[model samples]
Target: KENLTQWEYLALNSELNIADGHARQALSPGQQKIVNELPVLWAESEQRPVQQIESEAHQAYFTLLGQHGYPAEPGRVLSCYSSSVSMEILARSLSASVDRVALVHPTFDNIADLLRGNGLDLVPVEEDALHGADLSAELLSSVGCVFVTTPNNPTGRVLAEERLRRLAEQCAEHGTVLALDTSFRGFDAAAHYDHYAVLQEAGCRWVVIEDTGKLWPTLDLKAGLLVFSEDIGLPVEKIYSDILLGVSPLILALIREFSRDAADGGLADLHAFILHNRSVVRRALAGVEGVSFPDPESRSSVERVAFAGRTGTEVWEELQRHHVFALPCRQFHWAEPSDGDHMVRIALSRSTEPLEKSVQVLRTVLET
Candidate 1:
């Protein structure tokens, strides 16, 4: 009783794969102790009504998010098992016509897949390495929904500051709803997680998708949040209720407890760890010729390195032989896999041990 796309199968079957090029690091010992106490937390909640318990957990989670630079005012927060699920729910609520939606490019495949699966025209606008795209009126005029991920997926490129304002203004003027996906924000060194304040100040209604899975190592939970404008929050909630009802109270309890530390600067260490590991990746390949990554400032969690004469597919397959895993960027492209055919995204989220091993192998094979 399982269903998966062929692309999904390729990933699941691959060995030593970086799968999306992000490290799935293990939780620190302190967090592990908290996880070990999950049963007790759930036991405490077992006596309460599930609905009441989850509702409180939801509001508590919302407050935690607000403290993390994504405010809860003028909007309400909703949680689910995954951000993609929440994105779909919000998309369904925002648009009656799927074809009217425009998705920003160089993003994670799941975001595109979720929108395309809903029948969106799937506009694939190019995001330039240095200049980001112009979010002009003409570009957004025909679309009611615009989806974008800052610190974009394969490349980790962020939108230029000026262009971001233009986008917000254009979306507001056109009455377009903007969906800003911030799943990787935690990995970013930037002081703020998003520019929603600017987007909203210009009058655009927006929805943001944030996930806990990548922020820490709680992949099993897949905890996701959808924070929406006041106008759409109710409808979004209604849609979420009809489809997924609600996520587990047990999971919420865990997230609620863990997120408490985020406000006290707990997650700062995680960001530092990613950058430190990234340095390991950098030094490992520093002297190697013919391979390069996007400029350092745009990096976070993943390093999608480009090769001049080699196909990423060949490198990926060869790396498997060496017992290492890095994702070939082919499948993430909307044009043709060849658009990213020369690049493979390496996961910098790993700790020193495995990352060093990966770097060692990459140097060997890449050098040869």
Candidate 2:
């Protein structure tokens, strides 16, 4: 099915599943106010057509980018419904081939599926947790592209700054493009590192795919932004036109308001909440024998834990049977099956009560 996604597949198991990491944190009371006022916009639109709507959408998109310190030129940026759609367009625009792209791994599976889905010759490279990824000059010389998910999914680790600099230099030296799916950035405080400037200074052809859905907790909106190294020509413009005509003007209007108001400050409180919930899960599960959490270099809303003496399925099934939903790491498929089966992922997305109760239930299950 063209529409079914890996996230949709794995996220279906739990009645109270916490595997979907995040809080309803990015929304502003203003968005609701805007929503209420949209019917007025609709009524006012009696004489308007999509051209006017699209022009406003572009205006909103650029204005939002301007507020965020991004270059406001329409040539260097694009807007679409989701990061997924943007990446697909980028893949086609770059003429990505399956034999020419190296994908950083132990990441969310959909990225691999998406590139492979687009017929790119995808090579999987492991995330060296101790040393960061290996993007050596020799390593990237032959590839047309290198794709990395920083503040990576599953493990929640950000690439080290020095490592990113090295990769950017190597890619530029080799005439290879570098692409980052920055969906998980705001969750990590270390995300303050200016990756765009580093890549630009290194002079690599690069693309950044940013998602507002996870970063802002507007998960249902599918709002995404695509920024590139330079302005678009017919090749890239055609890619955008093919993938999306324009995002909803109403949604763009709301996002513009959000980008101005909540985009920066909204993350601070959410970061605190995730760290606090992470501590709660850690403290509750501390003394349980044979259970361990990988201390990812960066923090995000999810944690991956290793289970000794039990496969991931064993612990996952037991927890779910007790009506507690933790994710089994079965589908994060960059590693050997045994390695994947040894761990399960739990989301620290909730507040104190549900998280504490969930942790207590997991504690009891592991203790027994």
Candidate 3:
């Protein structure tokens, strides 16, 4: 299923299970029943009448976002397309050229790599836990767009909310766009419905990439959104109206309808819950041979205990020897002359029970 959206046998779990009170409480318990819903093609698909398509697409993104604590306003209305498209949408929306981008050290590399491959330039910046430096200003002048991963990838370092907001403010003043990728925002999944704070300012200029299914939600690509500001003069209707660019009616409906449930019912709580479990495993790993892991404080949801000093391949093979798998690493490092050991990013996106089992397996492998 990694290559495709869903394995043929996994079954597309599309519609709401309205047959139960848990799925639909507004109706009487007896009144609610499951129904074979339509296979929603894209809002761009020909299955719908020409007149109703725009409104339908609008309602879909709007309602789904609203359910997730984002108001149905234009600035709050961005698509959850893959990150590349999200970045493009943001760059264009902000009227800025993305020829050059700034990236922090030891963070996810997909965004930067992909951008560079497509002719964009990327400037690397190391996030040394230094304070009182004008880091935001430095990035703003150097790059067309700035990327910051809160509760950063690999290290799980959650940025102080104050510092993050201050960066946004600085980005706004310089006519630069701040691109904050909260792929690990779900780390504090318990605080569902909490909208991105960069959005609170009426006219802040920023782009937010949210990964809704990172930790507790299990590994899935429910990630997207490259929100720009109103100052750009992007027509309200033309903003994210292209259904073909992202999302299908079927998936959109499900997201809109289910996002609230996930938010209200503490869907993100699973992330925090899983974090607590991973902490102990990480602590024990700290005592293992040559296993110097990045501080969990530096990153948010997972830690990079892999071969930063060693080989990722070596760590991966050791992990595979015990039937454990961890391939959620970002791509950015230059390939070595030979096949060398690569890093393994241990994400807490799996079950706690299995995680504990994996921990024990790793312990034995390292003890050898």
Say which candidate scores most in lDDT. Answer: 1
Model 1: how far residue 223 lies from native, Å: 1.7
lDDT of 2 by residue, 1-368 (tens): 12114333454554455666644433456555655676865664544664455445444543433224444455455768887788778777766332567877677776776677667777667778323555565567767888888878888878777888888788777777788887777677565577766877788878878766664545466566777776222255678887777777566655554454444454455677678888888889888999888764548777888868888878877887777766667667553445678888877765577668778888898888
Best-to-worst order by TM-score is 1, 2, 3
Would you estimate the TM-scores of all the predictions? 0.86, 0.82, 0.67
Candidate 1, residues 1-368, lDDT tens digits: the string is 01113433445444444544434677776677768898897796787776566555555554544323345442266777888788888766765543566766566776766676666667677776224556666768888777778667766766655766777777778877777787776566451533656665666777878776666666557567887776533268788787776678788777766666554566677767777877887888888899787656765687878888899879988887887767777767764556888988787666678678778899889999
lDDT of 2: 0.67
- The lDDT per prediction is 0.68, 0.67, 0.48
Q: Which candidate number has the best TM-score?
A: 1
Cα deviation of 276 in candidate 1 (Å)? Answer: 1.7
In order of lDDT, best first, we have 1, 2, 3
